Amino acid sequence: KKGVSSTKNGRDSESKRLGAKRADGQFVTGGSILYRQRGTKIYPGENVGRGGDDTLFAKIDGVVKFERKGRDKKQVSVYAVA
Amino acid sequence: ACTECGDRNYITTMKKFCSRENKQTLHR
Amino acid sequence: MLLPKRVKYRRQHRPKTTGRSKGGNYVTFGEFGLQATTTSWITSRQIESARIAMTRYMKRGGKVWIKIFPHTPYTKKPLEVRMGAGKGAVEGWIAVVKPGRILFEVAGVSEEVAREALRLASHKLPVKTKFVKREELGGET
RNA sequence: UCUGGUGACUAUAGCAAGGAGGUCACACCUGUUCCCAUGCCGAACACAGAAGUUAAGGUCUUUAGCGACGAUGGUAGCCAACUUACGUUCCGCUAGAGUAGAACGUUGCCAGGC
RNA sequence: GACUGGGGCGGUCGCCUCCUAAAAGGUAACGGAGGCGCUCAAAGGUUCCCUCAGAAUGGUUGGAAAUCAUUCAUAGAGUGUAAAGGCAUAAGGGAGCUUGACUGCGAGACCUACAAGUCGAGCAGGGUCGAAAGACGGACUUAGUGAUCCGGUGGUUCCGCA
RNA sequence: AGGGUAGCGGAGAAAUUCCAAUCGAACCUGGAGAUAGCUGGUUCUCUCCGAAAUAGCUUUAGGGCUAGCCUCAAGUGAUGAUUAUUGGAGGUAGAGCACUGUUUGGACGAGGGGCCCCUCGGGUACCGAAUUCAGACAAACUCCGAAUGCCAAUUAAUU
Ligand SMILES: [Mg+2]
Ligand SMILES: [Mg+2]
Ligand SMILES: [Mg+2]
Ligand SMILES: [Mg+2]
Ligand SMILES: [O]
Ligand SMILES: [O]
Ligand SMILES: [O]
């Protein structure tokens, strides 16, 4: 009946709000984040710096562009605003 | 402690800056 | 009731599957085989009973297979309870059958005795059935 | 476009097998006095040499046996709409995977020898 | 004391990772699986160097378990720690030297009701490694935690009831 | 009959019983219009606009606060919305076995266990893994991977 007697598993509010935070064809400012992740689900290219949680940003203004490298693993690479 | 003679201790259970002579020192 | 066919769990609780549709899964081993056609899924107990039948009525040995195995449990919890609390204990195992699987297959016999044993099976399962000959797949490469 | 060094390209480059050549490339290679170095060891790294050789590494030729690529067609599924409560059906977008066909024994840039 | 498939007994009350979660995020349940309330003076930083588990066979220690020995071995190992993500130029394993586990800051972005949290190129000071470019503001990533008031210890360009 | 004990009390052969028809602590006045996160009630017409029933925290869940969602007056000034076109992040449906783990029947040889022969070996049903043929299964497996949606466009039409 009621109560008897169990777990209570369930630790259900556990959130961090990852993902992507910009898109291709998007002007962007220095210091701005593009894409949170972990490990290297995306690598950086040019005009980029990474951080102590595998975040990504742009050291300099420009225009975001993702790319392919080796049939598995991508990379992101700002290129110069004209 | 320090040999700038002022308590700075990031410890719990050494040749480095201390901001009184711009040097780096023991502490300790 | 009885659950002879069993395995290492890997986990004892699982969200169910409930069937929608498919075809396919032709015969590959024997000659004659049973095709499930319609609305249900299965427990092991049933399959065992069907095997008892299909082994008796065929003397002369006569070969049988079961192309499927229940990889899935079937949970059902204490008697006369209020709902709510944690998912219940194990009672059963399951082998889902969309319309198009081929449960039972045989060879070594003629066309008749097969067909009888298969009648005597399909009365002992939920699903409507159909009798089939191995003449063709829908692909041979 | 012969060789070599360095770059770019989704392994169509690869992997397995076999054939051929070297004192101009490179390599094996002789040796450890010095540079230096091996947790034992000049095997490795490194320095000094060029005695012998194409065997190996590496280069070129050919192979489609392995792996990667791979359409077109039609199928499952599904966005929208009509019926319907039917483990739904009919109609209009879209369009997989698996698979056959076929493709594949790389392609180009810069320098320097030639 | 609240939840509470009436209430009670039972169980839980915060945080980290997954799945349910519907190809961005977010998204509950007395739904399903696991943990944390630390550890390190090197397991940190930096310059160099190297590549494993497994398998085959011969050999003392013979579960072929111990080190050897080559060959095959596309990462099946290992990654301080729980799981997902990640890594082979290594983020793993060893050697040298050190101790950036620094000071003052911080444009600009995420997140979110708020309070809090997260990341941060770049400037200057003054230094470690390295030949030099260059790298370093803790640990591959995330959890390892506690408002304010009050009390205490040290310091000081502060005030101090004529 | 005449008298006493008076409520933070008295009396009680004790039942929480009696104390001016009332007693889990009488009665009247005053504090006092006590308090109420609760129920109930709220008075004359028209016109314009127009929701929500969620997130978080809450000795909180039928209350509250902030954000959402509305209205009004200023301000901004085409920034918003739908569609088309291009690009793009993720990994569901589906499919599949290349890792994880499950599984059936073969092939099986690497080799064993006894019962038995030998007595150094033969080992004659079951098997591990060895290697493989074919066929299957999955929210917490993925070599793969749709439709939809989501993010932006010194882009275009409508509004
Ligand atoms: Mg009395
Ligand atoms: Mg009143
Ligand atoms: Mg409000
Ligand atoms: Mg499925
Ligand atoms: O009142
Ligand atoms: O009142
Ligand atoms: O009142």
XYZ file of C-alpha atoms (C1' of nucleotides) and ligand atoms in Angstrom:
693
model
C 0.000 0.000 0.000
C 1.112 3.632 0.410
C 4.603 4.249 1.758
C 5.856 0.668 1.550
C 8.819 0.963 1.094
C 11.186 1.881 -1.639
C 13.658 4.066 -3.353
C 13.291 6.897 -4.412
C 15.871 6.892 -6.934
C 15.468 10.139 -8.782
C 17.677 13.180 -8.523
C 15.890 14.977 -11.204
C 16.800 18.696 -11.210
C 20.368 18.510 -12.578
C 20.877 21.128 -15.289
C 23.654 23.193 -16.832
C 22.210 24.518 -20.137
C 24.860 23.508 -22.649
C 24.743 23.588 -26.404
C 25.419 26.188 -29.036
C 24.953 29.911 -28.638
C 25.670 31.351 -32.102
C 25.155 30.303 -35.699
C 26.760 30.528 -39.101
C 26.411 33.765 -40.973
C 26.283 35.706 -37.732
C 28.349 38.751 -36.958
C 29.964 38.387 -33.586
C 32.002 40.343 -31.100
C 35.339 39.622 -29.497
C 35.250 37.611 -26.295
C 31.915 36.102 -27.340
C 30.998 32.478 -26.792
C 29.947 30.337 -29.740
C 29.547 26.885 -28.367
C 29.781 25.128 -25.042
C 30.725 21.485 -24.968
C 32.941 19.033 -23.170
C 36.018 17.264 -24.312
C 36.433 18.351 -27.882
C 33.122 17.671 -29.496
C 34.285 20.577 -31.637
C 37.829 21.722 -32.155
C 38.943 25.313 -32.636
C 40.550 26.750 -35.731
C 41.800 30.251 -36.324
C 40.958 33.348 -34.306
C 39.722 31.167 -31.414
C 40.614 30.391 -27.818
C 39.436 27.631 -25.513
C 39.049 27.486 -21.750
C 39.103 25.408 -18.605
C 35.838 23.657 -19.452
C 36.327 23.213 -23.195
C 34.245 26.252 -24.018
C 34.920 28.169 -27.184
C 35.039 31.811 -28.089
C 36.427 34.300 -30.535
C 39.482 36.336 -29.644
C 38.560 38.855 -32.346
C 35.509 40.017 -34.258
C 34.372 38.382 -37.456
C 31.949 35.838 -38.826
C 31.384 32.324 -37.561
C 31.979 29.323 -39.786
C 32.029 25.658 -38.879
C 33.952 23.158 -40.956
C 34.965 19.541 -41.386
C 38.453 18.176 -40.872
C 38.827 14.389 -40.997
C 35.397 12.823 -41.639
C 34.606 12.722 -37.897
C 35.549 15.869 -36.047
C 34.613 19.397 -36.915
C 36.073 22.758 -36.181
C 34.910 26.326 -35.824
C 36.787 29.214 -37.356
C 35.977 32.900 -37.319
C 37.051 34.679 -40.465
C 37.550 38.364 -40.912
C 34.617 40.702 -41.149
C 35.210 42.479 -44.438
C 53.757 33.901 6.881
C 56.111 35.920 4.711
C 59.474 37.640 4.709
C 57.598 40.682 3.659
C 56.384 39.930 7.213
C 52.669 39.753 6.526
C 50.343 36.793 6.676
C 49.380 35.308 3.318
C 48.568 31.592 3.370
C 46.566 29.721 0.786
C 46.815 26.412 2.670
C 44.904 23.858 4.691
C 45.120 20.198 5.728
C 57.892 28.813 -2.241
C 59.702 31.592 -4.072
C 56.832 33.829 -4.929
C 55.366 37.340 -5.193
C 54.021 39.224 -2.192
C 53.306 42.871 -3.190
C 55.308 44.982 -0.828
C 58.629 45.239 -2.705
C 57.478 43.894 -6.120
C 59.877 40.981 -5.498
C 59.325 37.259 -5.090
C 60.253 35.784 -1.711
C 59.942 32.771 0.607
C 56.665 32.793 2.573
C 58.017 30.742 4.221
C 3.633 -18.920 -14.215
C 6.780 -20.573 -15.522
C 9.805 -18.782 -16.981
C 12.392 -21.299 -18.181
C 13.687 -19.149 -21.055
C 15.738 -16.497 -19.307
C 19.115 -14.757 -19.326
C 21.433 -12.439 -17.511
C 19.321 -9.330 -17.008
C 21.761 -6.481 -17.382
C 18.862 -4.500 -15.761
C 15.631 -5.600 -14.144
C 13.294 -2.710 -15.009
C 12.506 -1.316 -18.435
C 9.968 0.819 -20.329
C 7.871 -1.435 -22.484
C 7.569 -1.641 -26.196
C 4.102 -1.740 -27.709
C 3.830 -2.786 -31.275
C 2.928 -0.724 -34.322
C 3.829 -2.459 -37.643
C 6.420 -4.139 -39.921
C 6.808 -6.905 -42.491
C 9.673 -9.133 -43.518
C 11.722 -11.796 -41.775
C 11.375 -14.641 -44.268
C 12.355 -18.243 -43.596
C 16.039 -19.173 -43.826
C 16.520 -22.453 -41.949
C 13.813 -24.986 -42.650
C 11.077 -25.385 -45.225
C 7.789 -24.842 -43.410
C 7.097 -22.055 -40.990
C 4.457 -20.165 -39.120
C 3.777 -16.486 -39.709
C 2.282 -14.326 -36.997
C -0.016 -11.747 -38.513
C -1.851 -9.599 -35.989
C -2.424 -7.875 -32.642
C -0.406 -9.102 -29.673
C 2.851 -9.837 -27.945
C 3.990 -12.844 -26.048
C 5.436 -14.471 -22.956
C 7.788 -17.437 -22.827
C 5.380 -19.824 -21.083
C 3.197 -19.815 -24.178
C 6.106 -20.651 -26.448
C 7.128 -23.584 -24.285
C 3.613 -25.028 -24.454
C 3.603 -24.676 -28.217
C 6.902 -26.537 -28.315
C 5.502 -29.398 -26.246
C 2.725 -29.753 -28.803
C 4.955 -29.494 -31.833
C 7.337 -32.105 -30.431
C 4.663 -34.621 -29.543
C 2.540 -34.745 -32.678
C 5.709 -35.119 -34.688
C 7.283 -38.427 -33.970
C 10.020 -39.440 -36.443
C 11.956 -36.777 -34.672
C 11.322 -33.930 -37.076
C 13.160 -30.701 -36.662
C 11.963 -27.509 -35.030
C 13.458 -24.119 -34.287
C 12.359 -20.962 -32.535
C 13.693 -17.942 -34.379
C 12.986 -15.594 -31.431
C 13.760 -15.321 -27.719
C 12.276 -13.010 -25.067
C 14.869 -10.351 -24.352
C 12.539 -8.209 -22.274
C 10.796 -8.335 -18.859
C 7.214 -7.871 -17.792
C 6.658 -6.216 -14.444
C 3.545 -6.550 -12.319
C 3.309 -5.602 -8.714
C 1.681 -6.679 -5.432
C -1.938 -7.553 -5.139
C -4.522 -4.924 -4.179
C -2.268 -1.875 -3.833
C -2.540 1.846 -4.173
C -0.669 3.216 -7.150
C 2.281 5.533 -6.913
C 5.408 4.032 -5.495
C 8.379 2.523 -7.267
C 7.952 0.230 -10.240
C 7.243 -3.324 -9.338
C 8.942 -6.653 -9.291
C 9.426 -9.085 -12.134
C 6.734 -11.415 -13.403
C 7.463 -12.615 -16.903
C 9.516 -12.143 -20.011
C 8.460 -10.912 -23.432
C 9.172 -11.451 -27.101
C 7.270 -8.871 -29.112
C 5.631 -9.920 -32.363
C 4.765 -7.366 -34.964
C 2.893 -8.695 -38.004
C 5.528 -10.447 -40.072
C 7.748 -12.375 -37.705
C 8.144 -16.084 -38.222
C 8.018 -17.753 -34.845
C 8.131 -21.457 -35.560
C 9.802 -23.281 -38.398
C 10.327 -26.940 -39.193
C 11.683 -29.360 -41.750
C 12.346 -33.061 -42.097
C 8.652 -33.837 -42.638
C 6.084 -33.563 -45.390
C 3.660 -30.732 -46.005
C 0.818 -32.160 -43.918
C 2.094 -33.027 -40.446
C 3.722 -29.632 -40.304
C 0.384 -27.991 -41.017
C -1.377 -29.976 -38.304
C 1.189 -29.205 -35.617
C 1.012 -25.569 -36.599
C -2.751 -25.537 -36.246
C -2.263 -27.120 -32.849
C 0.118 -24.281 -32.062
C -1.849 -21.306 -33.305
C -4.774 -22.367 -31.159
C -2.333 -22.002 -28.259
C -1.253 -18.431 -28.926
C -2.924 -15.014 -29.053
C -2.021 -14.073 -32.553
C -3.786 -15.048 -35.711
C -1.480 -16.934 -38.032
C -0.690 -18.082 -41.547
C 1.009 -21.114 -43.063
C 3.974 -20.590 -45.368
C 6.393 -22.448 -47.576
C 10.022 -21.511 -47.986
C 10.155 -20.802 -51.705
C 11.342 -17.192 -51.778
C 12.801 -14.356 -49.749
C 12.549 -10.776 -50.999
C 16.308 -10.573 -51.483
C 19.219 -12.967 -52.082
C 22.455 -10.926 -52.421
C 56.921 15.935 -65.291
C 62.029 12.141 -63.398
C 63.555 12.394 -58.228
C 63.565 14.879 -53.436
C 61.931 18.591 -49.212
C 57.509 21.087 -47.421
C 52.029 22.404 -47.678
C 46.441 21.608 -48.837
C 42.444 17.640 -49.864
C 36.442 13.270 -46.794
C 41.157 6.588 -47.067
C 38.533 7.409 -54.262
C 44.925 8.154 -51.062
C 44.595 3.009 -47.469
C 45.509 -2.198 -46.330
C 47.237 -7.547 -48.491
C 50.203 -9.642 -52.516
C 53.720 -9.911 -56.161
C 57.646 -7.520 -60.148
C 62.108 -3.825 -60.691
C 66.495 -0.125 -59.240
C 70.439 2.412 -56.553
C 78.030 5.596 -55.081
C 73.576 11.568 -58.030
C 68.411 11.189 -53.559
C 67.734 8.086 -49.151
C 68.822 4.209 -46.692
C 71.037 0.149 -44.681
C 75.769 0.580 -43.192
C 81.971 0.764 -40.178
C 83.042 2.588 -35.575
C 82.333 5.298 -30.611
C 88.272 9.775 -29.919
C 85.742 14.102 -29.153
C 79.693 16.717 -28.769
C 76.591 14.093 -26.146
C 73.527 9.855 -24.615
C 71.390 5.151 -22.995
C 66.972 3.908 -15.599
C 70.955 -2.316 -18.189
C 73.044 -1.537 -23.197
C 76.434 3.639 -28.815
C 70.079 -0.964 -29.698
C 67.842 4.469 -29.468
C 69.661 9.507 -29.477
C 74.165 11.835 -30.905
C 79.215 12.745 -33.103
C 82.960 11.163 -36.377
C 83.338 8.260 -41.180
C 81.795 6.120 -46.182
C 84.360 -0.473 -45.998
C 80.524 -3.135 -48.438
C 74.870 -3.371 -50.769
C 69.637 -2.999 -53.135
C 68.375 -7.471 -48.963
C 65.252 -4.397 -45.892
C 63.244 0.776 -45.139
C 61.692 3.980 -48.773
C 60.362 4.853 -54.485
C 57.832 3.089 -59.274
C 54.682 -0.547 -61.940
C 50.024 -4.021 -61.454
C 46.424 -6.237 -59.036
C 39.639 -4.525 -56.801
C 41.176 -10.265 -52.441
C 40.061 -6.793 -47.416
C 38.346 -1.904 -45.965
C 36.363 3.419 -47.204
C 33.051 5.916 -51.313
C 28.508 4.737 -53.880
C 24.192 6.521 -57.008
C 19.210 5.681 -59.703
C 14.860 3.202 -58.638
C 11.208 1.467 -55.039
C 10.357 0.399 -49.478
C 9.929 1.896 -43.731
C 9.032 6.762 -41.328
C 7.174 11.445 -41.035
C 5.416 17.413 -41.751
C -0.007 19.199 -43.682
C -5.002 17.900 -44.705
C -9.920 14.255 -44.930
C -11.907 10.203 -42.727
C -11.924 7.291 -38.539
C -10.877 4.680 -32.559
C -9.195 1.473 -36.480
C -2.052 -1.933 -32.928
C -6.092 2.825 -38.588
C -6.958 3.632 -43.814
C -6.883 6.989 -48.292
C -4.480 11.788 -50.446
C -0.451 15.720 -50.962
C 5.227 17.361 -49.277
C 9.659 15.308 -48.194
C 13.044 11.560 -48.416
C 16.542 7.336 -45.305
C 19.193 2.997 -43.971
C 20.286 -1.751 -45.917
C 21.475 -3.239 -51.144
C 22.723 -3.997 -56.280
C 25.005 -1.153 -60.116
C 29.192 1.442 -60.554
C 33.679 4.407 -58.581
C 38.674 3.467 -56.435
C 45.662 1.017 -56.686
C 44.982 9.276 -55.432
C 44.697 14.782 -56.717
C 46.739 19.646 -56.814
C 50.413 24.043 -54.564
C 55.646 26.161 -53.490
C 61.008 25.650 -53.539
C 65.513 23.088 -55.109
C 67.912 19.463 -58.375
C 66.361 17.398 -63.463
C 8.501 20.543 9.766
C 6.793 19.914 3.907
C 6.174 16.414 0.447
C 2.708 12.742 0.651
C -2.194 9.320 -5.302
C -6.807 10.544 2.135
C -3.661 11.036 6.326
C -0.176 8.001 9.489
C 4.488 4.408 9.887
C 8.166 3.854 6.095
C 11.469 6.975 2.475
C 13.494 11.546 0.938
C 14.732 16.929 1.693
C 21.423 20.117 -0.979
C 24.964 19.127 -5.269
C 27.528 16.228 -9.918
C 26.534 12.685 -14.373
C 23.125 9.766 -17.448
C 18.089 7.915 -19.447
C 12.746 9.038 -19.636
C 13.376 14.162 -22.942
C 9.894 13.944 -28.462
C 17.446 14.985 -33.610
C 18.995 23.114 -30.230
C 18.095 24.258 -25.146
C 14.389 23.505 -21.097
C 10.946 19.897 -19.654
C 7.717 16.598 -13.892
C 6.609 11.852 -11.263
C 7.096 8.163 -3.961
C 10.196 6.824 -12.427
C 14.643 4.028 -13.680
C 20.806 3.394 -12.531
C 25.533 5.409 -9.778
C 27.921 8.665 -6.591
C 29.972 13.537 -3.529
C 30.402 16.280 1.603
C 37.644 14.667 -0.767
C 42.759 13.897 -2.547
C 48.061 15.963 -4.583
C 54.190 19.541 -2.590
C 53.356 15.862 -6.892
C 49.113 13.236 -9.486
C 50.596 20.901 -10.406
C 53.560 24.128 -14.328
C 57.017 23.782 -18.300
C 60.912 21.513 -21.898
C 62.159 16.753 -23.902
C 61.058 11.430 -24.856
C 57.726 7.145 -25.457
C 53.052 4.315 -26.748
C 49.132 0.199 -24.194
C 45.569 -3.714 -23.202
C 44.666 -8.359 -25.341
C 46.692 -12.666 -28.800
C 50.471 -16.415 -30.643
C 54.741 -19.418 -29.497
C 59.555 -21.072 -26.382
C 61.008 -20.723 -21.578
C 62.109 -21.208 -13.215
C 57.863 -18.366 -10.131
C 53.833 -22.376 -14.450
C 44.917 -20.127 -12.814
C 49.728 -20.881 -20.333
C 48.309 -15.409 -13.918
C 54.404 -12.757 -12.173
C 59.461 -10.674 -15.723
C 61.270 -12.161 -20.564
C 60.914 -12.758 -25.999
C 59.241 -11.046 -31.059
C 54.791 -10.885 -34.252
C 49.557 -9.475 -34.874
C 47.114 -5.893 -32.283
C 43.071 1.621 -34.524
C 42.850 2.169 -29.219
C 39.236 -3.134 -27.175
C 43.950 -0.275 -22.161
C 44.882 3.901 -19.027
C 42.922 8.581 -17.820
C 43.418 10.299 -8.519
C 38.199 9.794 -7.933
C 30.679 8.166 -10.061
C 28.804 8.348 -15.240
C 28.287 10.610 -19.992
C 31.245 13.327 -23.281
C 36.467 13.392 -24.729
C 42.068 12.005 -25.836
C 47.105 8.510 -29.579
C 51.118 14.840 -31.960
C 48.619 12.358 -26.780
C 44.451 15.119 -22.098
C 47.931 8.755 -20.773
C 53.280 6.860 -19.123
C 58.619 8.291 -17.593
C 63.306 11.797 -17.093
C 65.547 17.446 -16.068
C 64.358 22.179 -13.656
C 61.164 24.650 -10.956
C 56.771 25.931 -8.009
C 51.679 30.686 -12.676
C 48.186 26.505 -6.602
C 51.074 35.162 -8.819
C 49.621 40.627 -7.963
C 46.241 44.471 -9.798
C 42.488 44.282 -13.401
C 38.980 43.177 -17.418
C 36.384 44.891 -22.364
C 32.787 41.220 -24.042
C 29.490 36.913 -24.007
C 26.526 32.691 -21.560
C 23.062 31.491 -17.473
C 19.249 33.158 -14.810
C 13.236 36.257 -11.462
C 16.883 37.634 -7.747
C 20.960 36.495 -4.878
C 24.777 33.468 -6.687
C 27.435 30.896 -10.769
C 30.583 30.398 -15.785
C 34.119 31.630 -19.400
C 37.454 35.222 -20.866
C 41.310 37.410 -25.252
C 43.789 41.661 -23.703
C 46.960 45.828 -20.388
C 50.631 46.682 -16.693
C 53.908 44.862 -12.577
C 57.309 41.053 -11.463
C 58.992 35.914 -12.520
C 59.615 29.848 -13.757
C 60.528 26.490 -18.135
C 62.580 26.791 -22.839
C 67.728 28.236 -27.558
C 63.832 30.947 -29.549
C 58.875 31.531 -31.017
C 56.003 30.543 -27.243
C 53.545 28.597 -22.645
C 51.778 29.191 -17.298
C 46.356 33.366 -13.512
C 45.826 24.751 -10.738
C 44.308 19.866 -11.378
C 40.877 16.569 -19.627
C 35.913 18.438 -18.526
C 31.973 19.091 -14.633
C 30.400 17.933 -7.658
C 33.990 17.801 -3.426
C 29.977 22.421 -0.550
C 27.169 27.350 3.560
C 23.871 34.310 2.762
C 23.954 38.007 6.368
C 24.577 39.451 11.617
C 28.005 38.342 15.462
C 32.811 36.952 17.664
C 38.262 36.184 16.734
C 43.679 36.784 14.629
C 47.132 39.982 11.608
C 47.930 44.485 8.845
C 46.727 49.914 7.740
C 46.939 56.535 2.680
C 41.188 55.778 7.686
C 37.868 58.057 11.903
C 38.366 58.818 17.084
C 32.327 63.420 20.702
C 37.051 70.322 22.988
C -33.490 27.098 59.483
C -28.809 30.206 60.384
C -23.485 30.398 58.565
C -18.361 29.588 55.815
C -14.801 28.371 51.572
C -14.959 31.462 45.079
C -12.377 30.466 39.779
C -3.980 30.941 38.378
C -9.688 28.940 42.989
C -13.070 25.921 46.010
C -15.437 21.275 47.325
C -15.009 16.443 45.605
C -16.798 7.900 49.101
C -12.819 10.744 42.717
C -17.164 10.354 37.563
C -12.968 15.341 34.823
C -18.400 15.343 38.600
C -20.772 20.310 41.003
C -19.814 25.578 41.526
C -27.567 29.831 39.964
C -30.421 25.224 34.214
C -23.859 25.775 30.622
C -17.455 23.924 32.965
C -10.911 19.982 29.258
C -11.495 25.766 34.019
C -18.071 29.821 35.737
C -20.279 35.113 35.280
C -20.291 40.756 33.856
C -17.616 44.892 32.575
C -12.644 46.990 30.464
C -8.162 46.210 27.427
C -11.131 45.498 22.428
C -13.611 47.555 16.426
C -8.194 41.571 19.795
C -6.787 38.467 16.121
C -8.214 35.082 10.875
C -2.804 33.286 5.352
C -10.621 30.967 6.283
C -15.868 31.087 4.570
C -19.644 34.548 3.559
C -21.307 39.464 1.820
C -19.512 44.615 -1.505
C -25.163 49.126 -3.892
C -26.552 53.329 -11.014
C -25.270 52.951 -17.270
C -22.395 52.672 -21.507
C -17.864 52.582 -24.464
C -12.334 50.618 -25.820
C -8.733 46.606 -24.810
C -8.108 41.848 -22.549
C -5.392 37.320 -19.603
C -3.510 33.221 -16.511
C -3.997 28.394 -13.889
C 3.353 28.244 -15.496
C 9.386 28.614 -13.698
C 12.177 29.371 -9.167
C 12.698 30.138 -3.721
C 9.473 29.674 0.221
C 8.613 25.227 8.421
C 5.800 26.564 1.333
C 2.210 23.625 -1.712
C -5.636 26.226 -0.902
C -1.008 32.073 0.891
C 3.240 35.247 -0.674
C 7.396 37.530 -3.870
C 9.929 38.114 -8.306
C 9.941 36.737 -14.015
C 6.013 35.329 -17.334
C 1.031 36.598 -19.654
C -2.551 42.208 -19.725
C -3.635 47.478 -19.653
C -2.523 52.901 -19.887
C 0.887 57.305 -21.195
C 5.479 58.754 -22.974
C 9.897 57.333 -25.829
C 12.548 54.340 -29.679
C 11.927 53.755 -34.670
C 11.199 49.292 -39.118
C 14.140 46.924 -35.502
C 8.910 42.187 -35.087
C 5.924 38.016 -37.568
C 4.979 34.279 -42.013
C 7.001 32.374 -46.393
C 11.051 31.537 -50.160
C 16.575 30.801 -50.729
C 21.444 29.462 -48.698
C 24.298 27.815 -44.503
C 24.416 25.486 -39.700
C 24.751 22.818 -34.460
C 22.262 17.437 -32.746
C 21.944 12.049 -33.193
C 14.971 11.048 -32.160
C 11.883 7.963 -35.683
C 13.842 4.383 -38.704
C 17.572 0.989 -39.864
C 21.628 -1.882 -38.239
C 25.411 -5.449 -35.337
C 31.182 -2.006 -36.230
C 31.908 -1.293 -29.807
C 28.389 -2.699 -25.078
C 25.425 -6.662 -23.642
C 21.596 -10.409 -24.921
C 20.446 -14.804 -28.542
C 19.249 -19.372 -32.012
C 20.947 -23.309 -35.191
C 25.193 -24.873 -37.786
C 30.499 -25.119 -38.715
C 33.041 -26.606 -35.237
C 39.057 -28.514 -32.605
C 42.220 -26.180 -28.899
C 40.978 -29.360 -25.548
C 39.121 -31.459 -21.654
C 35.817 -34.265 -17.391
C 34.467 -38.758 -15.721
C 32.210 -44.446 -17.032
C 35.653 -47.585 -19.301
C 40.234 -49.787 -22.073
C 45.062 -49.537 -21.601
C 48.095 -49.470 -16.398
C 51.963 -44.666 -22.723
C 47.713 -43.254 -24.756
C 42.712 -44.188 -26.583
C 39.270 -40.620 -24.258
C 33.816 -42.662 -25.712
C 27.461 -36.860 -23.941
C 28.759 -31.591 -22.345
C 31.574 -27.674 -23.018
C 34.840 -22.827 -22.478
C 37.200 -19.947 -25.627
C 39.704 -20.442 -30.231
C 37.619 -19.016 -35.927
C 33.436 -18.558 -38.721
C 28.185 -19.251 -41.983
C 23.420 -17.499 -41.470
C 19.266 -15.230 -38.645
C 17.649 -11.960 -34.507
C 17.025 -8.114 -29.892
C 17.874 -2.829 -27.013
C 15.461 4.093 -23.245
C 20.521 3.957 -20.130
C 24.445 -0.017 -27.727
C 25.144 2.878 -32.215
C 29.465 1.991 -38.737
C 24.701 5.321 -39.911
C 20.320 8.759 -40.051
C 15.485 11.193 -42.284
C 10.818 14.414 -41.824
C 9.488 18.519 -38.517
C 11.378 22.237 -35.499
C 15.651 25.691 -33.796
C 19.597 29.442 -34.799
C 21.493 33.708 -38.429
C 21.394 36.051 -43.295
C 24.359 44.264 -44.845
C 19.128 38.763 -49.390
C 13.767 39.148 -51.573
C 7.610 39.629 -51.232
C 3.499 40.572 -47.712
C 2.063 42.460 -43.250
Mg -20.513 13.715 44.476
Mg -14.505 41.553 15.543
Mg 3.766 40.818 -10.730
Mg 13.591 1.155 -32.594
O -16.110 42.764 16.024
O -13.825 42.966 14.238
O -12.924 40.355 15.068
